[PDB]
């Protein structure tokens, strides 16, 4: 298939493996999650514009909006973590081992 889809899928996998390998910050995790969403937006958009499927042109906007609301919720969770420990470090979130 087309050549641009290779790069958009590879971008989704790069943002996947960034989201699946945390370093320290939860904000960097949320950025990798939104990179995954952005690559999904681009890939859906290039397909729907290519196929001239008219009714799905409203589809990526929807894919934006919900997920950005999702991002808002994630930011709020991070802030609550930051209001407990002072930092958004993922190693502070280890109390549920016992």
Partner 1 sequence: MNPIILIIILMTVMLGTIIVMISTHWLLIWIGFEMNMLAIIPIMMKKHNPRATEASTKYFLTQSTASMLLMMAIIINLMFSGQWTVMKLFNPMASMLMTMALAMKLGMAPFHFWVPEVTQGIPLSSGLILLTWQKLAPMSVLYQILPSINLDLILTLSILSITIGGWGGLNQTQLRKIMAYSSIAHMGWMTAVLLYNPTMTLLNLIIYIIMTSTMFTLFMANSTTTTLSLSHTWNKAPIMTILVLITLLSMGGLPPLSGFMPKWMIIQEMTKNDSIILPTLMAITALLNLYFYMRLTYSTALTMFPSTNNMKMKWQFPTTKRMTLLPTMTVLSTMLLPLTPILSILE
Partner 2 sequence: YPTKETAHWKPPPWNDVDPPKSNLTLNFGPQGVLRLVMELSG
Partner 3 sequence: MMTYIVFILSIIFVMGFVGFSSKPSPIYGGLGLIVSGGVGCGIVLNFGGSFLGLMVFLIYLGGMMVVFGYTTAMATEQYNKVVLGTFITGLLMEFLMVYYVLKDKEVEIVFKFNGMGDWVIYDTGDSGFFSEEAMGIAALYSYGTWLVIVTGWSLLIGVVVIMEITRGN
Ligand X SMILES: CCCCCCCCCCCCCCCCCC(=O)OC[C@H](COP(=O)(O)OCCN)OC(=O)CCCCCCCCCCCCCCCCC
Interface residues toward partner 1, by CB under 8 A = 1, 5, 12, 16, 19-20, 26, 29, 33, 36-37, 40, 43-44, 47, 51, 53, 56, 59, 62-63, 66-67, 69-70, 73-74, 77-78, 80-81, 84, 93, 95-97
What are the DSSP calls for 9-38, one per residue? HHHHHHHHHHHTS--SBHHHHHHHHHHHHH
Residues, the chain: 98
Work out the angle between the directed axes of helices 26-51 and 59-85 (0-180°, nearest 10): 180
In Å, what is the CA distance from 55 to each residue of 12, 49, 64, 66? 25, 11, 16, 18
Minimum gap (Å) between residue 40 Cβ and partner 1: 5
Choose between 87 and 93: whose C-beta lies nearer to partner 3: 87
- At 79, list the tokens: 């802030």
User: How far apart (Å, rounded) are the C-alpha atoms in residues 19 and 13?
Assistant: 9
Is residue 85 part of the contact set for partner 2 (CB under 8 A)?
Answer: yes
From 15-23, 33-41, 50-58, 90-98, span contacting partner 2 (CB under 8 A): 90-98
Which residues contribute to the site for partner 3 (CB under 8 A)? 1-11, 14-15, 17-19, 23, 25, 27-28, 30-32, 34-35, 38-39, 41-42, 45-46, 48-50, 52-58, 60-62, 64-66, 68-69, 71-73, 75-80, 82-83, 87-88
């Amino acid at each position: 298939m087309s050549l641009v889809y290779m790069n958009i899928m590879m971008a989704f996998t790069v943002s996947l493996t960034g989201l699946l390998m945390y370093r320290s910050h939860l904000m960097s995790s949320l950025l990798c999650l939104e990179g995954m969403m952005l690559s999904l937006f681009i890939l859906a958009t290039l397909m729907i514009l290519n196929s001239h499927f008219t009714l799905a042109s409203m589809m990526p906007i929807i894919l934006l909006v919900f997920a950005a609301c999702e991002a808002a919720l994630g930011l709020s969770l991070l802030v609550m973590v930051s209001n407990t420990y002072g930092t958004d470090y993922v190693q502070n979130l280890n109390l549920l081992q016992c």
